[PDB]
Symmetry: C2
Subunit: 321 residues, 2 copies
Protein backbone atom coordinates (compact mmCIF):
# COMPACT_ATOMS: atom_id res chain seq x y z
CA UNK A 1 0.00 0.00 0.00
CA UNK A 2 1.22 3.56 -0.61
CA UNK A 3 0.63 6.73 1.36
CA UNK A 4 -1.59 9.40 -0.17
CA UNK A 5 -1.54 12.81 1.56
CA UNK A 6 -3.48 14.62 -1.15
CA UNK A 7 -6.94 13.18 -0.56
CA UNK A 8 -8.55 13.60 -3.97
CA UNK A 9 -11.67 11.67 -2.97
CA UNK A 10 -12.37 13.56 0.29
CA UNK A 11 -16.08 14.14 0.76
CA UNK A 12 -17.11 11.38 -1.66
CA UNK A 13 -19.06 8.22 -0.79
CA UNK A 14 -18.46 4.81 -2.28
CA UNK A 15 -19.89 1.33 -2.03
CA UNK A 16 -17.83 -1.82 -2.20
CA UNK A 17 -19.59 -4.67 -3.99
CA UNK A 18 -17.99 -8.13 -4.10
CA UNK A 19 -15.76 -6.58 -1.47
CA UNK A 20 -13.74 -9.70 -0.71
CA UNK A 21 -10.97 -8.65 1.67
CA UNK A 22 -11.89 -4.99 1.24
CA UNK A 23 -9.07 -4.05 -1.13
CA UNK A 24 -11.14 -1.37 -2.89
CA UNK A 25 -12.10 0.00 0.49
CA UNK A 26 -8.45 0.29 1.53
CA UNK A 27 -7.66 2.03 -1.75
CA UNK A 28 -10.52 4.54 -1.83
CA UNK A 29 -10.29 5.32 1.90
CA UNK A 30 -6.58 6.07 1.45
CA UNK A 31 -7.73 8.83 -0.92
CA UNK A 32 -10.22 10.17 1.60
CA UNK A 33 -13.44 8.55 0.35
CA UNK A 34 -16.07 7.18 2.75
CA UNK A 35 -17.50 3.68 2.53
CA UNK A 36 -21.30 3.71 2.95
CA UNK A 37 -22.10 0.11 2.01
CA UNK A 38 -20.24 -3.10 1.38
CA UNK A 39 -21.35 -6.48 0.13
CA UNK A 40 -19.45 -9.76 0.16
CA UNK A 41 -20.76 -13.23 -0.58
CA UNK A 42 -18.16 -15.47 1.09
CA UNK A 43 -18.51 -16.00 4.86
CA UNK A 44 -14.77 -16.36 5.47
CA UNK A 45 -14.17 -13.19 3.51
CA UNK A 46 -16.89 -11.43 5.55
CA UNK A 47 -15.06 -12.67 8.63
CA UNK A 48 -11.66 -11.17 7.81
CA UNK A 49 -13.34 -8.03 6.46
CA UNK A 50 -15.03 -7.66 9.85
CA UNK A 51 -11.71 -8.19 11.67
CA UNK A 52 -10.24 -5.28 9.76
CA UNK A 53 -13.06 -2.77 9.27
CA UNK A 54 -15.35 -3.39 12.26
CA UNK A 55 -18.47 -4.18 10.24
CA UNK A 56 -19.63 -7.27 8.38
CA UNK A 57 -20.49 -6.75 4.73
CA UNK A 58 -24.01 -7.65 3.68
CA UNK A 59 -24.24 -11.05 2.00
CA UNK A 60 -25.91 -12.25 -1.24
CA UNK A 61 -26.33 -9.09 -3.30
CA UNK A 62 -29.28 -10.72 -5.12
CA UNK A 63 -31.49 -10.50 -1.99
CA UNK A 64 -30.63 -6.82 -1.70
CA UNK A 65 -32.99 -4.45 -3.46
CA UNK A 66 -31.21 -1.63 -5.31
CA UNK A 67 -33.58 0.96 -3.76
CA UNK A 68 -32.12 0.13 -0.36
CA UNK A 69 -28.51 0.85 -1.43
CA UNK A 70 -27.30 4.12 0.18
CA UNK A 71 -26.62 7.10 -2.07
CA UNK A 72 -23.00 7.09 -3.22
CA UNK A 73 -20.62 8.77 -5.64
CA UNK A 74 -18.42 5.83 -6.64
CA UNK A 75 -19.44 2.20 -7.12
CA UNK A 76 -16.58 -0.28 -6.79
CA UNK A 77 -16.68 -3.93 -7.81
CA UNK A 78 -14.05 -6.55 -8.45
CA UNK A 79 -16.77 -8.83 -9.77
CA UNK A 80 -16.71 -12.50 -10.90
CA UNK A 81 -16.22 -13.02 -14.63
CA UNK A 82 -19.24 -14.79 -16.16
CA UNK A 83 -20.35 -15.43 -19.74
CA UNK A 84 -23.63 -13.91 -20.90
CA UNK A 85 -26.14 -15.75 -23.10
CA UNK A 86 -26.20 -4.83 -23.60
CA UNK A 87 -28.23 -4.19 -20.44
CA UNK A 88 -30.80 -6.96 -21.00
CA UNK A 89 -28.02 -9.26 -22.22
CA UNK A 90 -26.32 -8.94 -18.81
CA UNK A 91 -29.28 -10.45 -16.94
CA UNK A 92 -28.72 -13.63 -14.93
CA UNK A 93 -25.12 -12.72 -14.06
CA UNK A 94 -23.57 -11.06 -11.04
CA UNK A 95 -22.72 -8.18 -13.39
CA UNK A 96 -26.47 -7.52 -13.66
CA UNK A 97 -26.50 -6.75 -9.95
CA UNK A 98 -23.99 -3.99 -10.66
CA UNK A 99 -26.06 -2.76 -13.63
CA UNK A 100 -29.32 -2.64 -11.65
CA UNK A 101 -27.71 -0.72 -8.81
CA UNK A 102 -26.02 1.69 -11.24
CA UNK A 103 -29.35 2.32 -12.95
CA UNK A 104 -31.06 3.05 -9.61
CA UNK A 105 -28.38 5.03 -7.78
CA UNK A 106 -26.55 6.65 -10.74
CA UNK A 107 -23.15 7.12 -9.06
CA UNK A 108 -20.67 9.55 -10.62
CA UNK A 109 -18.17 6.76 -11.22
CA UNK A 110 -18.20 2.99 -11.67
CA UNK A 111 -14.82 1.43 -10.94
CA UNK A 112 -14.43 -2.29 -11.77
CA UNK A 113 -11.62 -4.79 -11.95
CA UNK A 114 -11.31 -8.25 -13.50
CA UNK A 115 -8.92 -10.89 -14.86
CA UNK A 116 -6.34 -10.02 -17.54
CA UNK A 117 -8.02 -12.14 -20.22
CA UNK A 118 -11.40 -10.50 -19.58
CA UNK A 119 -11.09 -8.72 -22.93
CA UNK A 120 -10.86 -12.15 -24.62
CA UNK A 121 -13.57 -14.06 -22.74
CA UNK A 122 -16.54 -15.42 -24.76
CA UNK A 123 -14.71 -14.37 -27.94
CA UNK A 124 -14.76 -10.75 -26.77
CA UNK A 125 -18.40 -10.06 -25.96
CA UNK A 126 -18.27 -10.44 -22.18
CA UNK A 127 -16.34 -7.17 -22.43
CA UNK A 128 -18.68 -5.90 -25.13
CA UNK A 129 -21.76 -6.61 -22.99
CA UNK A 130 -20.21 -4.81 -19.99
CA UNK A 131 -19.14 -1.86 -22.17
CA UNK A 132 -22.51 -1.60 -23.93
CA UNK A 133 -24.41 -1.94 -20.66
CA UNK A 134 -22.35 0.89 -19.17
CA UNK A 135 -22.90 3.05 -22.27
CA UNK A 136 -26.66 2.38 -22.20
CA UNK A 137 -26.66 3.44 -18.54
CA UNK A 138 -25.17 6.78 -19.67
CA UNK A 139 -21.53 6.16 -18.69
CA UNK A 140 -18.29 6.37 -20.63
CA UNK A 141 -16.08 3.24 -20.54
CA UNK A 142 -12.30 3.21 -20.13
CA UNK A 143 -10.53 -0.11 -19.84
CA UNK A 144 -6.87 -1.03 -19.71
CA UNK A 145 -4.88 -4.02 -18.63
CA UNK A 146 -2.32 -2.98 -16.04
CA UNK A 147 0.42 -5.15 -14.54
CA UNK A 148 1.23 -4.90 -10.83
CA UNK A 149 5.00 -4.93 -11.51
CA UNK A 150 4.63 -1.57 -13.31
CA UNK A 151 3.12 0.06 -10.22
CA UNK A 152 5.54 -0.74 -7.42
CA UNK A 153 4.40 -4.26 -6.56
CA UNK A 154 6.73 -7.17 -7.31
CA UNK A 155 4.20 -9.54 -8.78
CA UNK A 156 3.45 -10.68 -12.28
CA UNK A 157 -0.24 -9.85 -12.26
CA UNK A 158 -2.10 -8.32 -15.17
CA UNK A 159 -5.70 -7.39 -14.57
CA UNK A 160 -8.22 -5.31 -16.47
CA UNK A 161 -9.38 -2.11 -14.82
CA UNK A 162 -12.58 -0.48 -16.05
CA UNK A 163 -13.48 3.07 -15.12
CA UNK A 164 -16.82 4.61 -16.09
CA UNK A 165 -17.90 8.22 -15.67
CA UNK A 166 -21.52 9.42 -15.79
CA UNK A 167 -21.82 11.39 -19.03
CA UNK A 168 -23.39 14.54 -17.53
CA UNK A 169 -20.15 15.19 -15.66
CA UNK A 170 -18.34 15.62 -18.99
CA UNK A 171 -15.07 14.05 -17.83
CA UNK A 172 -12.56 14.12 -20.69
CA UNK A 173 -9.22 13.92 -18.93
CA UNK A 174 -9.23 10.59 -17.14
CA UNK A 175 -5.95 8.81 -17.55
CA UNK A 176 -4.67 5.50 -16.33
CA UNK A 177 -1.62 6.00 -14.11
CA UNK A 178 1.67 5.86 -15.93
CA UNK A 179 3.95 2.89 -15.18
CA UNK A 180 7.16 3.47 -13.23
CA UNK A 181 10.37 1.67 -12.26
CA UNK A 182 9.99 -1.23 -9.81
CA UNK A 183 12.04 -0.68 -6.65
CA UNK A 184 10.66 -3.44 -4.43
CA UNK A 185 11.25 -7.14 -5.00
CA UNK A 186 10.08 -10.34 -3.35
CA UNK A 187 13.14 -10.40 -1.11
CA UNK A 188 12.04 -7.07 0.36
CA UNK A 189 8.75 -8.58 1.58
CA UNK A 190 9.88 -11.77 3.27
CA UNK A 191 9.33 -12.78 6.91
CA UNK A 192 12.21 -14.20 8.98
CA UNK A 193 12.98 -17.89 8.32
CA UNK A 194 11.55 -18.91 11.71
CA UNK A 195 8.04 -17.75 10.88
CA UNK A 196 7.86 -19.78 7.69
CA UNK A 197 9.56 -23.06 8.57
CA UNK A 198 6.25 -24.88 8.17
CA UNK A 199 6.08 -23.73 4.55
CA UNK A 200 9.39 -25.32 3.63
CA UNK A 201 9.20 -28.34 1.37
CA UNK A 202 12.30 -30.55 1.23
CA UNK A 203 12.15 -32.79 -1.81
CA UNK A 204 14.60 -35.26 -3.30
CA UNK A 205 13.23 -34.66 -6.80
CA UNK A 206 14.23 -30.99 -6.57
CA UNK A 207 16.36 -29.96 -9.53
CA UNK A 208 17.95 -26.52 -9.42
CA UNK A 209 18.50 -25.38 -13.00
CA UNK A 210 19.85 -21.86 -12.50
CA UNK A 211 22.09 -20.07 -10.03
CA UNK A 212 20.66 -17.35 -7.77
CA UNK A 213 20.89 -13.97 -9.49
CA UNK A 214 22.98 -11.01 -8.32
CA UNK A 215 20.79 -8.09 -9.35
CA UNK A 216 17.10 -7.56 -8.69
CA UNK A 217 15.08 -7.69 -11.88
CA UNK A 218 11.43 -6.90 -12.62
CA UNK A 219 10.58 -10.33 -13.98
CA UNK A 220 9.93 -13.83 -12.68
CA UNK A 221 13.19 -15.75 -12.45
CA UNK A 222 12.88 -19.54 -12.39
CA UNK A 223 15.70 -21.29 -10.49
CA UNK A 224 14.46 -24.86 -10.28
CA UNK A 225 11.68 -27.43 -10.48
CA UNK A 226 10.29 -30.33 -8.55
CA UNK A 227 8.53 -33.36 -10.03
CA UNK A 228 7.39 -32.77 -13.60
CA UNK A 229 8.10 -29.03 -13.40
CA UNK A 230 4.52 -27.95 -14.02
CA UNK A 231 2.02 -25.81 -12.09
CA UNK A 232 2.97 -25.36 -8.46
CA UNK A 233 6.19 -27.25 -9.20
CA UNK A 234 8.51 -24.36 -10.03
CA UNK A 235 10.98 -22.50 -7.82
CA UNK A 236 11.64 -18.78 -8.30
CA UNK A 237 14.21 -16.21 -7.18
CA UNK A 238 13.18 -13.71 -4.48
CA UNK A 239 15.37 -11.21 -6.33
CA UNK A 240 12.80 -11.23 -9.10
CA UNK A 241 9.09 -10.63 -8.79
CA UNK A 242 6.44 -13.06 -7.53
CA UNK A 243 4.59 -15.35 -9.92
CA UNK A 244 0.86 -14.69 -10.09
CA UNK A 245 -0.92 -15.71 -6.87
CA UNK A 246 -3.68 -18.18 -7.65
CA UNK A 247 -6.73 -18.88 -5.47
CA UNK A 248 -7.29 -22.37 -6.80
CA UNK A 249 -4.02 -23.58 -8.31
CA UNK A 250 -2.65 -26.99 -7.35
CA UNK A 251 0.79 -28.58 -7.15
CA UNK A 252 3.44 -28.93 -4.45
CA UNK A 253 3.85 -25.16 -4.20
CA UNK A 254 0.14 -24.51 -4.81
CA UNK A 255 -1.26 -20.94 -4.80
CA UNK A 256 2.01 -19.09 -4.18
CA UNK A 257 4.64 -20.88 -6.19
CA UNK A 258 7.91 -21.89 -4.57
CA UNK A 259 10.80 -19.62 -3.70
CA UNK A 260 14.47 -20.20 -2.95
CA UNK A 261 14.91 -18.58 0.43
CA UNK A 262 18.16 -18.99 2.38
CA UNK A 263 19.03 -22.42 0.96
CA UNK A 264 15.46 -23.69 1.24
CA UNK A 265 12.49 -24.01 -1.12
CA UNK A 266 9.19 -22.86 0.31
CA UNK A 267 5.79 -21.38 -0.41
CA UNK A 268 5.06 -17.79 0.50
CA UNK A 269 3.49 -17.10 3.90
CA UNK A 270 -0.01 -15.56 3.97
CA UNK A 271 1.59 -12.30 5.19
CA UNK A 272 3.97 -12.37 2.25
CA UNK A 273 0.94 -12.90 -0.01
CA UNK A 274 -0.69 -9.86 1.61
CA UNK A 275 2.42 -7.81 0.90
CA UNK A 276 2.70 -8.89 -2.74
CA UNK A 277 -0.96 -7.89 -3.17
CA UNK A 278 -0.20 -4.50 -1.62
CA UNK A 279 -2.07 -5.14 1.65
CA UNK A 280 -0.65 -3.19 4.63
CA UNK A 281 0.90 -5.06 7.57
CA UNK A 282 -1.87 -3.58 9.70
CA UNK A 283 -4.25 -5.85 7.76
CA UNK A 284 -5.15 -8.97 9.73
CA UNK A 285 -5.13 -12.04 7.51
CA UNK A 286 -7.43 -15.02 7.92
CA UNK A 287 -6.23 -17.53 10.57
CA UNK A 288 -6.41 -20.38 8.07
CA UNK A 289 -3.30 -20.45 5.87
CA UNK A 290 -5.21 -22.21 3.07
CA UNK A 291 -8.12 -19.77 3.26
CA UNK A 292 -5.68 -16.83 3.24
CA UNK A 293 -4.07 -18.13 0.04
CA UNK A 294 -7.48 -18.40 -1.62
CA UNK A 295 -8.52 -14.97 -0.48
CA UNK A 296 -5.34 -13.20 -1.61
CA UNK A 297 -5.10 -15.18 -4.83
CA UNK A 298 -8.58 -13.88 -5.60
CA UNK A 299 -8.02 -10.32 -4.45
CA UNK A 300 -7.11 -6.98 -6.01
CA UNK A 301 -3.74 -5.25 -5.99
CA UNK A 302 -4.16 -2.31 -3.63
CA UNK A 303 -1.47 -0.03 -5.04
CA UNK A 304 -2.88 -0.07 -8.57
CA UNK A 305 -6.36 0.75 -7.32
CA UNK A 306 -4.85 3.63 -5.32
CA UNK A 307 -3.19 5.21 -8.38
CA UNK A 308 -6.40 4.80 -10.35
CA UNK A 309 -8.56 6.13 -7.49
CA UNK A 310 -6.28 9.15 -7.23
CA UNK A 311 -6.69 9.77 -10.95
CA UNK A 312 -10.46 9.35 -10.74
CA UNK A 313 -10.44 12.01 -8.01
CA UNK A 314 -8.14 14.18 -10.15
CA UNK A 315 -10.61 14.02 -13.01
CA UNK A 316 -13.67 14.66 -10.83
CA UNK A 317 -11.98 17.67 -9.23
CA UNK A 318 -10.94 19.45 -12.42
CA UNK A 319 -13.92 21.74 -12.88
CA UNK A 320 -12.80 25.04 -14.40
CA UNK A 321 -15.13 27.88 -15.28
Amino acid sequence: MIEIKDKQLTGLRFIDLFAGLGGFRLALESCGAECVYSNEWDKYAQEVYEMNFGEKPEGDITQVNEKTIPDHDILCAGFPCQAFSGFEDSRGTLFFDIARIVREKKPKVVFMENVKNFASHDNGNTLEVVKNTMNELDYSFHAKVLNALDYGIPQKRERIYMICFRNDLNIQNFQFPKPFELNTFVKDLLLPDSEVEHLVIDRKDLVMTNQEIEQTTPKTVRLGIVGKGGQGERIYSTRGIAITLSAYGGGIFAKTGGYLVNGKTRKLHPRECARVMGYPDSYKVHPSTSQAYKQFGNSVVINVLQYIAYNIGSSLNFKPY
Copy 2:
Protein backbone atom coordinates in the same frame (compact mmCIF):
# COMPACT_ATOMS: atom_id res chain seq x y z
CA MET B 1 -10.66 -51.46 7.45
CA ILE B 2 -11.89 -55.07 7.73
CA GLU B 3 -11.76 -57.48 10.62
CA ILE B 4 -9.31 -60.37 10.41
CA LYS B 5 -9.50 -63.12 13.05
CA ASP B 6 -7.36 -65.59 11.14
CA LYS B 7 -4.02 -63.87 11.76
CA GLN B 8 -1.97 -65.37 8.94
CA LEU B 9 1.05 -63.17 9.68
CA THR B 10 1.28 -64.03 13.39
CA GLY B 11 4.91 -64.36 14.41
CA LEU B 12 6.33 -62.34 11.52
CA ARG B 13 8.19 -59.02 11.77
CA PHE B 14 7.77 -56.19 9.30
CA ILE B 15 9.24 -52.78 8.62
CA ASP B 16 7.26 -49.83 7.34
CA LEU B 17 9.32 -47.59 5.04
CA PHE B 18 7.89 -44.33 3.65
CA ALA B 19 5.33 -45.05 6.35
CA GLY B 20 3.20 -41.96 5.82
CA LEU B 21 0.14 -42.39 8.05
CA GLY B 22 1.10 -46.01 8.80
CA GLY B 23 -1.44 -47.62 6.47
CA PHE B 24 0.80 -50.62 5.93
CA ARG B 25 1.22 -50.90 9.67
CA LEU B 26 -2.55 -51.06 10.21
CA ALA B 27 -2.97 -53.71 7.51
CA LEU B 28 -0.13 -55.98 8.57
CA GLU B 29 -0.88 -55.65 12.31
CA SER B 30 -4.48 -56.64 11.60
CA CYS B 31 -3.07 -59.92 10.24
CA GLY B 32 -0.97 -60.54 13.33
CA ALA B 33 2.38 -59.13 12.23
CA GLU B 34 4.60 -56.97 14.46
CA CYS B 35 6.17 -53.70 13.31
CA VAL B 36 9.88 -53.52 14.24
CA TYR B 37 10.87 -50.38 12.37
CA SER B 38 9.23 -47.47 10.62
CA ASN B 39 10.58 -44.57 8.64
CA GLU B 40 8.80 -41.47 7.36
CA TRP B 41 10.32 -38.37 5.78
CA ASP B 42 7.57 -35.82 6.42
CA LYS B 43 7.43 -34.02 9.79
CA TYR B 44 3.65 -33.75 9.85
CA ALA B 45 3.23 -37.39 8.84
CA GLN B 46 5.50 -38.36 11.76
CA GLU B 47 3.25 -36.33 14.10
CA VAL B 48 0.03 -38.14 13.21
CA TYR B 49 1.86 -41.47 13.04
CA GLU B 50 3.03 -40.86 16.62
CA MET B 51 -0.50 -39.85 17.69
CA ASN B 52 -1.75 -43.21 16.49
CA PHE B 53 1.04 -45.66 17.29
CA GLY B 54 2.82 -44.03 20.22
CA GLU B 55 6.17 -43.81 18.43
CA LYS B 56 7.82 -41.45 15.96
CA PRO B 57 9.22 -43.08 12.81
CA GLU B 58 12.88 -42.42 11.96
CA GLY B 59 13.49 -39.70 9.35
CA ASP B 60 15.50 -39.45 6.08
CA ILE B 61 15.98 -43.05 4.93
CA THR B 62 18.88 -42.06 2.66
CA GLN B 63 20.99 -41.40 5.75
CA VAL B 64 20.04 -44.59 7.57
CA ASN B 65 22.59 -47.38 7.46
CA GLU B 66 21.02 -50.55 6.04
CA LYS B 67 23.01 -52.73 8.45
CA THR B 68 21.27 -51.00 11.37
CA ILE B 69 17.75 -51.87 10.15
CA PRO B 70 16.12 -54.50 12.39
CA ASP B 71 15.76 -58.06 11.10
CA HIS B 72 12.37 -58.57 9.48
CA ASP B 73 10.33 -60.95 7.38
CA ILE B 74 8.36 -58.41 5.36
CA LEU B 75 9.52 -55.04 4.07
CA CYS B 76 6.67 -52.69 3.20
CA ALA B 77 7.02 -49.54 1.18
CA GLY B 78 4.53 -47.21 -0.47
CA PHE B 79 7.27 -45.23 -2.19
CA PRO B 80 7.37 -42.10 -4.41
CA CYS B 81 7.47 -42.94 -8.13
CA GLN B 82 10.61 -41.57 -9.79
CA ALA B 83 11.97 -41.88 -13.33
CA PHE B 84 15.22 -43.78 -13.76
CA SER B 85 17.99 -43.05 -16.27
CA GLY B 86 18.36 -53.07 -13.41
CA PHE B 87 19.78 -52.36 -9.94
CA GLU B 88 22.31 -49.78 -11.14
CA ASP B 89 19.60 -47.72 -12.90
CA SER B 90 17.77 -47.23 -9.60
CA ARG B 91 20.58 -45.08 -8.18
CA GLY B 92 19.55 -41.47 -7.67
CA THR B 93 16.08 -42.63 -6.60
CA LEU B 94 14.26 -43.49 -3.37
CA PHE B 95 13.80 -47.02 -4.73
CA PHE B 96 17.56 -47.40 -4.45
CA ASP B 97 17.17 -47.20 -0.68
CA ILE B 98 14.62 -50.00 -0.75
CA ALA B 99 16.98 -52.11 -2.85
CA ARG B 100 20.05 -51.60 -0.66
CA ILE B 101 18.01 -52.45 2.43
CA VAL B 102 16.63 -55.55 0.72
CA ARG B 103 20.14 -56.59 -0.30
CA GLU B 104 21.45 -56.46 3.29
CA LYS B 105 18.38 -57.66 5.21
CA LYS B 106 17.00 -60.30 2.80
CA PRO B 107 13.38 -60.27 4.00
CA LYS B 108 11.12 -63.18 3.01
CA VAL B 109 8.81 -60.70 1.28
CA VAL B 110 8.93 -57.20 -0.16
CA PHE B 111 5.48 -55.58 -0.35
CA MET B 112 5.31 -52.35 -2.35
CA GLU B 113 2.60 -50.03 -3.64
CA ASN B 114 2.61 -47.15 -6.12
CA VAL B 115 0.47 -45.18 -8.59
CA LYS B 116 -1.74 -46.90 -11.18
CA ASN B 117 0.32 -45.78 -14.18
CA PHE B 118 3.58 -47.14 -12.66
CA ALA B 119 3.27 -49.89 -15.28
CA SER B 120 3.30 -47.42 -18.20
CA HIS B 121 5.71 -44.92 -16.62
CA ASP B 122 8.84 -44.01 -18.64
CA ASN B 123 7.30 -46.47 -21.10
CA GLY B 124 7.51 -49.55 -18.89
CA ASN B 125 11.11 -48.80 -17.95
CA THR B 126 10.29 -47.73 -14.38
CA LEU B 127 8.55 -51.02 -13.58
CA GLU B 128 11.21 -52.94 -15.54
CA VAL B 129 13.91 -51.43 -13.37
CA VAL B 130 12.05 -52.36 -10.18
CA LYS B 131 11.32 -55.88 -11.42
CA ASN B 132 14.85 -56.53 -12.71
CA THR B 133 16.34 -55.17 -9.48
CA MET B 134 14.18 -57.47 -7.36
CA ASN B 135 15.12 -60.35 -9.65
CA GLU B 136 18.82 -59.52 -9.28
CA LEU B 137 18.35 -59.50 -5.49
CA ASP B 138 17.02 -63.06 -5.85
CA TYR B 139 13.27 -62.29 -5.52
CA SER B 140 10.35 -63.32 -7.72
CA PHE B 141 8.19 -60.35 -8.75
CA HIS B 142 4.39 -60.16 -8.89
CA ALA B 143 2.52 -56.97 -9.71
CA LYS B 144 -1.05 -56.01 -10.46
CA VAL B 145 -3.17 -52.89 -10.58
CA LEU B 146 -6.14 -53.18 -8.22
CA ASN B 147 -9.00 -50.72 -7.82
CA ALA B 148 -10.24 -49.86 -4.32
CA LEU B 149 -13.86 -50.12 -5.57
CA ASP B 150 -13.39 -53.84 -6.22
CA TYR B 151 -12.37 -54.46 -2.61
CA GLY B 152 -15.15 -52.96 -0.54
CA ILE B 153 -14.03 -49.33 -0.62
CA PRO B 154 -16.12 -46.71 -2.42
CA GLN B 155 -13.35 -44.83 -4.15
CA LYS B 156 -12.16 -44.85 -7.70
CA ARG B 157 -8.50 -45.55 -6.95
CA GLU B 158 -6.28 -47.85 -8.97
CA ARG B 159 -2.81 -48.49 -7.62
CA ILE B 160 -0.12 -51.00 -8.48
CA TYR B 161 0.73 -53.51 -5.81
CA MET B 162 4.04 -55.34 -6.09
CA ILE B 163 4.81 -58.41 -4.03
CA CYS B 164 8.16 -60.18 -4.14
CA PHE B 165 9.09 -63.45 -2.49
CA ARG B 166 12.68 -64.49 -1.81
CA ASN B 167 13.54 -67.27 -4.29
CA ASP B 168 14.56 -69.89 -1.71
CA LEU B 169 11.00 -69.95 -0.36
CA ASN B 170 9.80 -71.29 -3.73
CA ILE B 171 6.44 -69.55 -3.43
CA GLN B 172 4.39 -70.65 -6.43
CA ASN B 173 0.89 -69.94 -5.27
CA PHE B 174 0.64 -66.25 -4.46
CA GLN B 175 -2.53 -64.74 -5.80
CA PHE B 176 -3.94 -61.26 -5.66
CA PRO B 177 -7.31 -61.12 -3.89
CA LYS B 178 -10.34 -61.66 -6.09
CA PRO B 179 -12.58 -58.59 -6.50
CA PHE B 180 -16.10 -58.58 -5.08
CA GLU B 181 -19.36 -56.66 -5.19
CA LEU B 182 -19.24 -53.23 -3.60
CA ASN B 183 -21.91 -52.70 -0.92
CA THR B 184 -20.63 -49.50 0.70
CA PHE B 185 -20.92 -46.07 -0.91
CA VAL B 186 -19.89 -42.53 -0.08
CA LYS B 187 -23.24 -41.76 1.59
CA ASP B 188 -22.56 -44.57 4.09
CA LEU B 189 -19.31 -42.97 5.20
CA LEU B 190 -20.50 -39.38 5.65
CA LEU B 191 -20.43 -37.29 8.83
CA PRO B 192 -23.56 -35.53 10.14
CA ASP B 193 -24.05 -32.10 8.54
CA SER B 194 -23.20 -30.33 11.81
CA GLU B 195 -19.59 -31.55 11.64
CA VAL B 196 -19.02 -30.40 8.08
CA GLU B 197 -20.63 -26.99 7.39
CA HIS B 198 -17.17 -25.38 7.21
CA LEU B 199 -16.57 -27.47 4.09
CA VAL B 200 -19.69 -26.25 2.30
CA ILE B 201 -19.11 -24.20 -0.83
CA ASP B 202 -22.00 -21.95 -1.86
CA ARG B 203 -21.61 -20.74 -5.46
CA LYS B 204 -23.51 -19.23 -8.39
CA ASP B 205 -21.76 -20.75 -11.39
CA LEU B 206 -22.99 -24.17 -10.22
CA VAL B 207 -24.56 -26.03 -13.13
CA MET B 208 -26.32 -29.29 -12.34
CA THR B 209 -26.63 -31.60 -15.35
CA ASN B 210 -28.35 -34.51 -13.60
CA GLN B 211 -30.71 -34.92 -10.67
CA GLU B 212 -29.61 -36.85 -7.59
CA ILE B 213 -29.74 -40.58 -8.42
CA GLU B 214 -31.96 -43.01 -6.52
CA GLN B 215 -29.84 -46.12 -7.05
CA THR B 216 -26.41 -46.77 -5.50
CA THR B 217 -23.67 -47.54 -8.01
CA PRO B 218 -20.00 -48.58 -8.01
CA LYS B 219 -19.08 -45.68 -10.29
CA THR B 220 -18.31 -41.99 -9.94
CA VAL B 221 -21.50 -40.10 -10.72
CA ARG B 222 -21.00 -36.51 -11.78
CA LEU B 223 -24.09 -34.40 -11.14
CA GLY B 224 -22.72 -30.98 -11.89
CA ILE B 225 -19.87 -28.58 -12.44
CA VAL B 226 -18.65 -25.20 -11.34
CA GLY B 227 -16.53 -22.77 -13.38
CA LYS B 228 -15.09 -24.60 -16.40
CA GLY B 229 -15.74 -28.10 -15.07
CA GLY B 230 -12.10 -29.13 -14.82
CA GLN B 231 -10.03 -30.43 -11.89
CA GLY B 232 -11.71 -29.86 -8.52
CA GLU B 233 -14.62 -28.24 -10.33
CA ARG B 234 -16.90 -31.28 -10.46
CA ILE B 235 -19.77 -32.28 -8.18
CA TYR B 236 -20.49 -35.95 -7.54
CA SER B 237 -23.31 -37.98 -6.00
CA THR B 238 -22.63 -39.66 -2.66
CA ARG B 239 -24.74 -42.58 -3.87
CA GLY B 240 -21.78 -43.46 -6.10
CA ILE B 241 -18.11 -43.85 -5.19
CA ALA B 242 -15.62 -41.15 -4.32
CA ILE B 243 -13.49 -39.59 -7.02
CA THR B 244 -9.77 -40.29 -6.49
CA LEU B 245 -8.36 -38.30 -3.52
CA SER B 246 -5.42 -36.08 -4.50
CA ALA B 247 -2.65 -34.61 -2.35
CA TYR B 248 -1.85 -31.72 -4.68
CA GLY B 249 -4.96 -31.27 -6.78
CA GLY B 250 -6.34 -27.76 -7.18
CA GLY B 251 -9.71 -26.27 -7.99
CA ILE B 252 -12.66 -25.05 -5.94
CA PHE B 253 -13.19 -28.55 -4.54
CA ALA B 254 -9.48 -29.39 -4.37
CA LYS B 255 -8.14 -32.74 -3.12
CA THR B 256 -11.51 -34.41 -2.43
CA GLY B 257 -13.73 -33.16 -5.22
CA GLY B 258 -17.19 -31.80 -4.56
CA TYR B 259 -20.23 -33.72 -3.35
CA LEU B 260 -23.96 -33.06 -3.31
CA VAL B 261 -24.95 -33.65 0.30
CA ASN B 262 -28.41 -32.80 1.68
CA GLY B 263 -28.93 -29.92 -0.77
CA LYS B 264 -25.42 -28.49 -0.33
CA THR B 265 -22.21 -28.84 -2.35
CA ARG B 266 -19.15 -29.54 -0.19
CA LYS B 267 -15.70 -31.11 0.03
CA LEU B 268 -15.25 -34.31 2.00
CA HIS B 269 -14.06 -33.90 5.60
CA PRO B 270 -10.66 -35.46 6.40
CA ARG B 271 -12.52 -38.10 8.47
CA GLU B 272 -14.54 -38.96 5.37
CA CYS B 273 -11.24 -39.07 3.47
CA ALA B 274 -9.92 -41.51 6.08
CA ARG B 275 -13.00 -43.66 5.65
CA VAL B 276 -12.81 -43.74 1.86
CA MET B 277 -9.17 -44.80 2.28
CA GLY B 278 -10.21 -47.58 4.68
CA TYR B 279 -8.77 -45.99 7.83
CA PRO B 280 -10.67 -46.96 11.03
CA ASP B 281 -12.56 -44.29 13.02
CA SER B 282 -10.08 -44.96 15.82
CA TYR B 283 -7.37 -43.43 13.62
CA LYS B 284 -6.73 -39.81 14.59
CA VAL B 285 -6.38 -37.47 11.61
CA HIS B 286 -3.94 -34.56 11.55
CA PRO B 287 -5.17 -31.53 13.56
CA SER B 288 -4.52 -29.41 10.43
CA THR B 289 -7.31 -29.93 7.88
CA SER B 290 -5.16 -28.98 4.88
CA GLN B 291 -2.35 -31.24 6.06
CA ALA B 292 -4.78 -34.13 6.53
CA TYR B 293 -5.97 -33.76 2.94
CA LYS B 294 -2.39 -34.02 1.64
CA GLN B 295 -1.77 -37.05 3.80
CA PHE B 296 -4.86 -39.02 2.82
CA GLY B 297 -4.49 -37.95 -0.80
CA ASN B 298 -1.08 -39.67 -0.87
CA SER B 299 -1.91 -42.64 1.33
CA VAL B 300 -2.69 -46.32 0.77
CA VAL B 301 -6.05 -48.07 0.84
CA ILE B 302 -6.09 -50.16 4.00
CA ASN B 303 -8.57 -52.85 2.96
CA VAL B 304 -6.67 -53.72 -0.24
CA LEU B 305 -3.46 -54.04 1.74
CA GLN B 306 -5.25 -56.27 4.26
CA TYR B 307 -6.47 -58.65 1.58
CA ILE B 308 -2.99 -58.80 0.03
CA ALA B 309 -1.23 -59.19 3.39
CA TYR B 310 -3.55 -62.10 4.18
CA ASN B 311 -2.68 -63.75 0.87
CA ILE B 312 1.03 -63.19 1.43
CA GLY B 313 0.56 -65.03 4.71
CA SER B 314 -1.52 -67.71 3.03
CA SER B 315 1.36 -68.37 0.62
CA LEU B 316 4.08 -68.25 3.28
CA ASN B 317 2.13 -70.73 5.39
CA PHE B 318 1.46 -73.37 2.74
CA LYS B 319 4.45 -75.65 3.29
CA PRO B 320 3.52 -79.28 2.58
CA TYR B 321 5.93 -82.16 2.79
